[PDB]
Structures are given as structure tokens and as C-alpha cells.
Amino acid sequence: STAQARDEQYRNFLRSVSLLKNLPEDKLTKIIDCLEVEYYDKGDYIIREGEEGSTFFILAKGKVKVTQSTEGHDQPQLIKTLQKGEYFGEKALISDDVRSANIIAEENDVACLVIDRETFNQTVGTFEELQKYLEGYVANLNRDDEKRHAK
Numbered sequence: 050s051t052a053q054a055r056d057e058q059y060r061n062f063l064r065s066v067s068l069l070k071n072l073p074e075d076k077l078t079k080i081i082d083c084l085e086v087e088y089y090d091k092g093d094y095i096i097r098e099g100e101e102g103s104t105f106f107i108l109a110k111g112k113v114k115v116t117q118s119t120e121g122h123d124q125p126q127l128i129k130t131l132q133k134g135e136y137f138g139e140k141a142l143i144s145d146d147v148r149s150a151n152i153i154a155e156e157n158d159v160a161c162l163v164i165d166r167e168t169f170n171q172t173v174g175t176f177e178e179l180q181k182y183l184e185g186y187v188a189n190l191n192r193d194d195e196k197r198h199a200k
């Protein structure tokens with residue numbers, strides 16, 4: 050349809066994302082303008098632990114699992130699942146680190162909205178309330194990683 054109507058469809062979804070509900074319009078618009086879409090089928094690794102990463106992901110369709118290598122275990126342990134409306138991949142950006150867990154599609158036809166580091170920094174990373182929320186969440190993820198003896 051129009052660019053505007055496509056944008057409205059993305060705006061409506063992004064405003065249903067709890068993380069983004071309070072973001073200023075101009076930064077939401079920048080996410081709409083800069084996002085890309087990636088599709089995955091069941092078992093695909095969206096993120097692999099021990100890889101460089103500088104992109105942030107919003108799950109628009111489907112479910113993924115979060116797994117992580119830990120001490121005393123040979124296979125990665127299942128931390129949680131994420132569903133439509135949730136997000137992942139901020140930690141590498143905020144911690145300036147390699148990817149710290151695997152993100153694996155649990156269903157066929159998973160769809161992610163992806164933005165790069167500069168876009169992230171200029172939107173999420175620039176709106177104080179959200180920046181601080183994610184920085185604090187990442188600090189807790191560090192303590193969870195320590196608790197479970199992440200390798």
C-alpha cells in the first residue's frame with residue numbers, strides 16, 4: 050500500500066511491545082524506518098553463543114528458546130523461552146561483549162525485526178527511561194549468569 054500504511058502497521062505492532070510503549074514518536078519512527086525483517090524455521094539459531102553481535106531483535110512472530118553453556122553440563126541449558134512482543138540481543142550491545150547465549154527458533158515461520166547498533170543507540174539507547182531499564186536488566190542477567198555458572 051502506501052509507505053505510510055505499511056508504517057502504520059509496524060507502528061501498531063511496535064506500540065504493542067511493552068518495551069517500546071513509552072518511546073517518543075520520533076524514535077519509534079526511526080525504528081520503523083531502519084528495521085529489517087528476518088525469518089527463521091524450527092531449530093534455526095538466530096544468535097549463537099561465542100559470536101560477535103551488534104544487532105537488536107524484536108520477536109514479531111513465533112517463539113524462541115534461550116540456551117546457555119554452563120559448568121557441569123555438556124549441552125547448553127534452557128534458560129527461558131521468549132514469544133511475540135519480547136526482544137533479545139541488547140546485552141552484547143550494552144555490555145560490549147560477544148553473544149552470551151543462543152537464541153533458537155522453536156517454531157517454523159518465526160519473524161524478527163532487527164535493528165543495528167547505531168539505530169539501537171539512537172533510539173532505545175537514547176531514551177533515558179528505557180536505557181536505564183535495559184541496563185538494569187542486563188546487570189541482573191550478569192548475576193543470573195554467575196548464579197548458574199555460565200561458562
Ligand SMILES: Nc1nc(=O)c2nc(Sc3ccc(Cl)cc3)n([C@@H]3O[C@@H]4COP(=O)(O)O[C@H]4[C@H]3O)c2[nH]1
Binds near residue numbers: 096140186190
Ligand atoms: N547472558 C544472558 N543470560 C540470561 O539469563 C539471558 N536471558 C535472556 S532472554 C532476555 C532478553 C532480553 C533481556 Cl533485557 C533480558 C533477558 N538473554 C538474552 O540472550 C541473548 C543472547 O545474545 P546477547 O546479545 O548476549 O543478549 C542476550 C539476552 O538478550 C540472556 N542472556
Ligand SMILES: [Ca+2]
Binds near residue numbers: 081082
Ligand atoms: Ca520506509
